[PDB]
Structure formats: C-alpha cells, structure tokens
Amino acid sequence: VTDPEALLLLPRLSIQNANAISSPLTWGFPSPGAFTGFVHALQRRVGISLDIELDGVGIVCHRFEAQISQPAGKRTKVFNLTRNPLNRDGSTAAIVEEGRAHLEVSLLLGVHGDGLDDHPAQEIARQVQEQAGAMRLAGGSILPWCNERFPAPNAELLMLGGSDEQRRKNQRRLTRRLLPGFALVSREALLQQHLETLRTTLPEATTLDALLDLCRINFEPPWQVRDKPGWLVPIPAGYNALSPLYLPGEVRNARDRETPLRFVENLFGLGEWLSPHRVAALSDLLWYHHAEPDKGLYRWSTPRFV
Amino acid sequence: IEKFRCSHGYNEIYKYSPDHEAYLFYCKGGQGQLNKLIAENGRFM
Amino acid sequence: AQICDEALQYAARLRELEPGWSATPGCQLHDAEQLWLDPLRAQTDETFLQRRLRGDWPAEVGNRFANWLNRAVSSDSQILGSPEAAQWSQELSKELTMFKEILEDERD
Amino acid sequence: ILSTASVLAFERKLDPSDALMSAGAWAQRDASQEWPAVTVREKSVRGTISNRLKTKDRDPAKLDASIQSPNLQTVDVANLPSDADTLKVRFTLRVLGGAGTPSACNDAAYRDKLLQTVATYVNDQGFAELARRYAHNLANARFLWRNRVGAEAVEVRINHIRQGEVARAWRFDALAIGLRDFKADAELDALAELIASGLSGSGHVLLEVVAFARIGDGQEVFPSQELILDKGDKKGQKSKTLYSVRDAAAIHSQKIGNALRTIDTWYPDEDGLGPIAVEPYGSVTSQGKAYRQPKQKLDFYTLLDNWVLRDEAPAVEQQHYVIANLIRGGVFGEA
Amino acid sequence: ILSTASVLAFERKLDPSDALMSAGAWAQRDASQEWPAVTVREKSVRGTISNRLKTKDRDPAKLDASIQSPNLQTVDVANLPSDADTLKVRFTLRVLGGAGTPSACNDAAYRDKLLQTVATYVNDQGFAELARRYAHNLANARFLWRNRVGAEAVEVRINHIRQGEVARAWRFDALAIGLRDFKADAELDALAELIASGLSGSGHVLLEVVAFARIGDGQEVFPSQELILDKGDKKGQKSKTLYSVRDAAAIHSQKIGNALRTIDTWYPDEDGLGPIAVEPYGSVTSQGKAYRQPKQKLDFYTLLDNWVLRDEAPAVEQQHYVIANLIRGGVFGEA
DSSP states (O other): OOOOSEEEEOOOEEEEEEEOBOSSSOBSSOOHHHHHHHHHHHIIIIITTTTEEEEEEEEOOSEEEEOEEOOTTOSSOEEOOOOOOOOTTSOOOOOOOOOEEEEEEOEEEEEEETHHHHSOHHHHHHHHHHHHTTOBSSSSBEEOOOSSSOOOOOOOEESOOSSHHHHHHHHHHHHHHTTTSOEEEEOHHHHHHHHHHHHHHSSSOOHHHHHHHHHSOOEEOOOEEOOOSSEEEEEEEEEEESSOOOOTTTSTTOSOSSSOOOOEEEEEEEEEEEOTTSSSOTTSSOOEEEOOTTTOOBEEEOTTOO | OOSEEEETTTTEEEEEOSSSSSEEEEEEOOHHHHHHHHHHHOSOO | OHHHHHHHHHHHHHHHHOSGGGSSOOSOSOTTOOSTTHHHHHSSOSSSSSHHHHTTOOOTHHHHHHHHHTTSSOOOHHHHHSTHHHHHHHHHHHHHHHHHHHHSOOOO | OOOOOSOEEEOOSSEEOOEEEEEEOTTOGGGTTSOOBOOEEEEEEEEOOOSOOOSSSOOHHHHHHHHTSOEEEEEEEEEOOTTOOEEEEEEEEEEOOOOSOOSEESOHHHHHHHHHHHHHHHHHSOTTHHHHHHHHHHHTTOSSSSSSTTOSOEEEEEEEEOSSSEEEEEEEETTTSOSSOOOOOHHHHHHHHHHHHHHTTSSOEEEEEEEEEEOOTTOEEOOOBOOOOOOSOSSSOOOBOBOBSSSSBEEOHHHHHHHHTEEEOOOSSOGGGOOEEOOTTOEETTTTEESSOTTTTOSHHHHHHHHHTSOOOOOHHHHHHHHHHHHHOEEOOOO | OOOOOSOEEEOOSSEEOOEEEEEEOTTOOTTTTSOOBOOEEEEEEEEOOOSOOOSSSOOHHHHHHHHHSOEEEEEEEEEOOTTOOEEEEEEEEEEOOOOSSOSEESOHHHHHHHHHHHHHHHHHSOTTHHHHHHHHHHHTTOSSSSTTTTOSOEEEEEEEEOSSSEEEEEEEETTTSOSSOOOOOSHHHHHHHHHHHHHTTSSOEEEEEEEEEEOOTTOEEOOOEEOOOOOSOSSSOOOBEEOBSSSSBEEOHHHHHHHHTEEEOOSSSOGGGOOEEOOTTOEETTTTEESSOTTTTTSHHHHHHHHHTSOOOOOHHHHHHHHHHHHHOEEESOO
16 A cells, blocks of 8 residues: 555564464564554544654564474474363363464554654654554554663654665664564565466466475485475464355444454465564565455555565 | 494394494384395495 | 674674673783773773774774675685686675774764 | 304403503613603694695686685694603503403303314413413504604613512613514513513413603604594694693503504415404504405404314414404404 | 596605794894793784775765774784794704605506606706705795894704704805795705705705794784684684694794795796796685696696506696696695
C-alpha cells in the first residue's frame, strides 16, 4: 500500500507465551498475521487519538525459545503443555495441545499521518510504547522490562531525509540498533519460480510440493545436500475463502453481529529469515494487509521488498 | 597409495595424511575396523 | 555475504551482551580489534579509550578476516594460476568493502 | 602340527635412555659433569622456493610472483655456544637378558618350541657375535647420528655402573673404529663380554655412555626432531620442532636404540653398503629400500617360522639376525 | 630407463654458525677477544603515514585526520657503543665434503649414476673453481650484509683451526677484494686449496672467520631480523625484533650461508648484475626476479636431469652451478 512517512521502532519486546503453532502445517515462530493484527490493534487503540496511521510491521526476533522437548529415541519434538483445571466432577479435562514460545522481537512499524507534525516524535513513540506495554502479541503477554539495567527506549526515525546520505546514515543507525535479530520477509516470487523450475523437472507439480522441497534437506547422488539460498521457512500467508461471505446477523455464534463472517482456510506461502542489513532499505521489510474481499484471498506479505 | 594402514599386531589404524608424507594414528582396531573404514571412506585416497 | 552477516552478528551479540571484553586485563586480548568492546571502552573510559577509538576509527578487522577467509579456498597451484582466484579475490574484496563500510560507522 | 602362536610380544632388551646433549670445551672433558646443556631455541628462516615444479607452474610470471611471496617459518635450532666446540651426548643403556622368552604367547607348545630353539642357539653360540656388534655400535659413536658426520675427533666413554659407581671404564676413539667394519680389540672384547653377560641373564649390566665430539665453536648440533601441530598461520609456521626433556636438547631413546641395532651385515644384497638396523624385512628409511624381502627367504618372519615350526635352522649369520630381532622386541604374530 | 629418484635429500656442506657481532675500537683488533657484545635494545619510534594511497584516501580532510593520529612502535635496535667504531662479526664455518652422496635416495640405480656423475666431475676438475669463489665470499666480507655498505675499512681474518689452535692464519682487506670480481691472489689460492681439501673430503676443515668493519662511533649495525607474533595493541606493537643468541646480537646462520653461496656468475642474464646466490631457479629475493627460469634450460633441475639421466653433460660453468647446488643441499626429487 502507501509508503510510510516515518518508521517507528518498538524496541526489544519480550513475549512470554506466544503461539508456537503458527498454522496446521507449520510450528515455530508465530504467524506474521499476529504482528499485522497487533499493529492494527495498536492503530485501533491509539492511532485514532494521535491522528496517525500505524501500518505495516517489521519483524526482527532477537531471540526465540519454543517450549518444546525432544522425546527419547525420536527425531521429532513435542510441546510442553499446561495443566488446565478439572471439570465439575473432578475428572481431568481433555488436553488440547497449545504451543508456547518465548520471543524477543522488535517491531519496525510504519507510521504516516498528520499527527507527526502536531506532536513530538518521542511523545508519540512513548505513547505507543505505553500502550503496547498492556497488550499481547501472539497470545503471549508482553513483558515490560522492569528493574533491569536500563529500559530500551524508542526512536521514531523520520523516513523523509534531507539527503540520501542522511537517510542512509540514520537508517544505518537504526539497523545497528536492531542488529542482533533476523528480519522476516515474504518471498513468494522465489516460491513461484521454484514452482516453474520444478514443473520443468516433472510436470503437474503443485507449489505445495515446491514449498515442501524448499523446506526439506534433500540429498543428491553424485552424495551432496542441496544448497538453499538463505533461511527459507514456510509461513502461513493469510486465508482463502471456503464459504460465501455471510451477513453480520446471519451466522450462528459469531464474535459479533455487526461484522460479516466467512469460513476460511490457511494459505501457506514462504518466508526468508535474513539479517536486517541485507535489504539496504528499511522502508521495505514491512508486513501489510491485502484483502481483496470479493474473491477471498485475505493475505499478508511484504510488498515493495525486491 | 593406500588411505588406511592397519598395524596388525598392535591393533592400530593409521590413516594417510598428505601434508607430511606419512601416516598418522587414526584409531584402534584390527581388520574389521580397517575394512569398515575402507567401506566408509574408500581406499587409495 | 552470509559469512560477513554472521561475523557482524557474532560481533554485535558479543558487543551488546556481556561486559566480558573488558572483564579482566592482561597482555593478550588481540586489542587491535576494538569492535567486540564498543561500549566497554566508551561507556567506562570517557577520554582514555573513547577518544582513542573515535579518532582512530578501528575498522581494520576486514583484512585479518580476509586472511582468515583465504583459507576457505584450497591452496592449489592450478586454482591460483587460473582466473578463479581472480574472481574469488574481486568478490571477496567487494564483500570486505561492505564489511568495512558497516564496521566504520560505530561512533554514531 | 605346531602352527605359529597368534600372539607373541617380545619385550625390548637393550633399553637406552634419552640422550642428553650438553656442550663445553675439549681438553676438559674430564670435568664435564657441570657442562651447560645445549638449549633448543627458535630462529626464523625465510626461503625462496626450490622444490621441483610440476610443469604447470613453469610460467616465469607465476614463478616470479611466487618467489615475491616467500615462505616465512620459525625453526627450532640447537647450536653449541660460541665458546664451546665439544658436544657431550650422555645416555644410559640397560642390557636385560632373557632374550627368547616372550612376554605374551597363546600357544604353550609353540612357546616351549621357541624357548627350546633360542636355548639351543645360546648353548651352541652365546650372545658373542651380537654383543660384539652392539659393543661396536657403542664404541664408534653411531648414536651421534648427524653430530658425527663432520666431527674433528669423537671419543666415547663407557662406564659399567655397579652398586653406585663405575666398576669398569672404557675409552674409545670413535673415528678409528669405523662405522662399517666389526674388527677385534682388547677393550671391545671386554665390552662385548660385558654385554654378553648382560644378554645371557648372568648379570645386571647398566652402562653409562658418554660421547664427546669436536664440532667447532657455535656449530649446529642435531637433536632428535619432533612432529608439529600445524594449527596456525603460515608465517609463524613452526616448520621444525626439536626434542628436549627439560630445557635441554636430546636425542630420542629409540633413535639411540636404532643406532645400536645397526649390526645386520648379513642381508642378501651387497655388503659394501654397510650394516643396517635389525628389522623384519630389514629396511632403511633413508634409502627407502627393504632388504630381506619375503620373496627371498631371508626376512625375519620366514626365517623364524622355518627355525621354530619346521626345524629348518638357517645359517649362523641368519640366526644371529633372528636372535637380534628377538632382542629388538615387537609383536610377531598374526591377526 | 633410469628415471629420477622420488626422494633426494642432500645435506648442507659448508655449515656456518650464527655470526656473533661484538664491538670495539680499531687498531686494537689484535686484542679483540674480550670485546663487549653488541646488545639489542628497544626504542620507540613515531611515524607519519608515508605509504602510497589508493585514490580513496586522497581526501585532504581524511589524510589530515590520519596524520593527526601517528602510529607508535617499539623497535629493537642494535648500535655500536659511543666509544667504539668497529664491528667485529665472528662465526665458524665447517667445510664437510662428500658433496655427491645424497642423505636419502630411493632408486639405487639413480644414486649410483649420480655418484658416478659427481665423481666424473671431481676427477675432471676438482672443487677448485667453487672453492675459489667461496674463498672470495669469505675474503670480501659479503656476510656483513648491510654492515659492509658504508664501512670505511673492512678486514677479514680467517683462521684454520686444527686440534685446538690455529694451523694457518689469513688476513684480508675486504674492500680491495670486490664484491663482483673473482680475481686471483696468493693468499686466496691458499684458502681455495683449503676449502678444496675440505670439500673433497680429504681433510677436516674448520675455519674461524672474524671480520672487522670501521663503521663509526655509535653507528647502527644490522643483525638478522626475527619475525613477530602480532598479538598486542597498536601502541606497543614491537614491530621489529632482532636476532640475538644470549644478550648478544647475531646474524642467522642461513644468512651467512646465503652470502657465502653468492658465486653464481653463470646465469643467462647480464653479468653486470653481479654474482647471485646458488639456488635452483636461481633467484634473488630482493630483486623479486628468478634467473635460470625453467623455460630456459638452465635451472638446476633440468641441468641435473640432463646430466645424470641422459648423459647430456652441460658446459663446465653450468656444472659448476650444479655441483654448487649439491654443496648447497636441499630437498630435490618429485612426489
């Protein structure tokens, strides 16, 4: 969509029990839809008051730790669960496996609007930080950095630079700040061209199979592993329609009766974990919302990446 | 030029190194470990 | 580019994580680096090491890293006689130039 | 049927020690108990390439570019002091005895046959040629390996050490006694009888062998040479490290032992090439040629198996060689 | 067929020692046995940037910011004392002989052919040109490498050391004997006959070479230079280390040997460029050029392989060069 007028940096945010179950096919880091919905919840809660439009999100993930455990004698992993309460008779309830993970991410969220000129930059930065302190990011509480050495503050970098050199200079200053992490971007063109080459190899190939080929460490005979460009992962890239769009007060047991509902299903794209100084433009690497509601296809990606 | 040399009475496997022109001590074992290492790494360098 | 990325990554996580680069002194720390102790020399010594690092701008780690990275190719006489060593050196020089350009701006 | 035992391990008779090389001045060798040791120190060498090129590197531009980036090494070097012209190499040698008895043997019948064979040898002819040749290799300072090759005068002093002190002293001119002839001498025969009584188990023999060599003031001496890590860069390469026990250069014990065993003048090839060391398939590493190959019937293994199993006793020279291999020690037995 | 041997190691004939440099005053050089040694001491140096810039550092503000921060070093330096104008450089040289025999050689047929080739050379013309040129490089103090270049008067004293004392003493004026002409003399032929009898194996030759040089009071002398570890900070770098054996400055033995070998006036390029050191693919590392490249048929390897294998004996100058390489030593032979 539209380009950001400024680039706010929420600092290293600790999330204690995020949803490690991203999707029915992927586990690990939470879905980027969690971060885009979080930024839209931030806009819904302070962006209408500071007259700004917080839009887009850059995911950095300084550290990650899934609450998993590899069982004895297996190559796979399982999830450490919680003990839910008993039922009304004292019987143990049926265990529903939820993944939990401890994250330390920082969010490069793009901000544009008329509120940039009305308030100081540090003022709106402190406002959205004090709002995000009372929120949750993927089902996990945001730990607010109390009584450590020093709180990591904000810096709203203005994307409009007086030069190209000043723009690259404070961009390099920001990239040094979010440097111990690993930026997550949407790489769907590489998945599409990998589909084309794999279809050239053997026809009627799905890009589900191209995704699966880009995930696995496949071996080749002369033995040599297939090289992979970068840290290629599968991500859930939004939802696809399974149902016609129902009326607000038509579907039974919705969340609300003023919003149209539609039964949907995940869409598994591809993402790439790269170091944040590779991109040379932090105006990119932001995850936006692309609905196109008449067709379905509610999805998120990083447009203007390459 | 053989990649492994078993010293037979002393139960030592010597693997050829190319930097210095000599064999160096690889592991212990006899003919079975020698044949298994030949099957894994291939002889004749 | 990836090996430069994780070298800068290792340097960054050491430089922000621990004060261990200035934990205990001696005679041997390979102190000409001055990148793994960025807040360990300026946030503690005000004019002793911070003015000895901001004007000097110690970014010389690129050529020592190139000497370490030169081991990665085989030391074959045909590999050095062919133009593959020339292509190797020009791409390595470009990537150490980028490592230089990111390593120099540590005083901002 | 009397097959060969699957294990045989013979322990090493003629045990020498690490030979500690110290330095000083000739004409006071008799006061050489406080001579300072030769220290191994580091110098740094720089050499142009001199190895053969493999017809691909014979481009003159590539050759000049290679010699413009020359090889920097450090080397361990050991020299005499600049006021000292004599190298004293002092070790002790134990002659144990009980040569044919193995330290391990599966077959009891083979062990009885081997013990009968060695005892038949010793009764027919004692350790009299073997100890004569060992006493020669103590007398001519062959254990001075490259420290002997240009020496002005070498002199060996061998003391038989009884309960605390010298019981009998020898003193030889190690250059008059050649490196290739086993002659007879009144003192060499006395040392031969002492090593004979040691190898026969009829006495405890411990010799203290001291060898002085006129090399020259500050010249290089050659201790035994170790093998290097090669974990670091190619300029502080450390291309050569030398042996030293405690800040004092030394020759390895098995190098002294290899020079002691150099008695085999009975190999089937030409005898003008001198004695070689007693080895099965009697081989010399410097020449890279294995005399006593098993295609001919003259290695240690076929001679021992013909002597013990099927009673084909070889000629007296070849059984001297077989018993010298039993004195040398080792594991002689299959997998 | 007679292919070349796979290993070929020749031991170094003409062994020099580390050239100890001490200091004193001229006209009492005859009492120069208690002269104090030249000590290697440290001093600080502060340098401006003076190397070439690669058209990215040619900004004036960047260059001024560079010259604002100068580089600091401590360097090892060796000077004469302020009351001594003469540098005495003293070493011993041991001439061994037996130049044809390799110390390690695989093919016995190649070894016999190479021995026959070198014996044919020695019988046709002994070590007489080579010893005359080695005696010149002893006579003119070429082993004083940079300590010779500004000296007012250089005098070399060479003593043949027998059983404990001087058998024959020489004394040369090393500046009248040039660095480039191998002329004839009365005393240089006596030294050439001595080095001839040493290299022929017909006698033990140990020369004590002492060279004096009028440099000047407190002037800098130039011992051999070690290489550094490069481990500490940019202020106390210790960027220069000088060789010393025990608190006494010294030139390396291989540097004295490279100055002694500088006899090769038979390389195909111009002979106004002087003699060079005897190397295979005869190369001077200062000049960065390799004379006797293998694209011409005048390196050591193709000359030796045409002489020994296929009997193509070269001109007597080239076989002087080949036998000078065999005196030089080396690791010859392929892989």
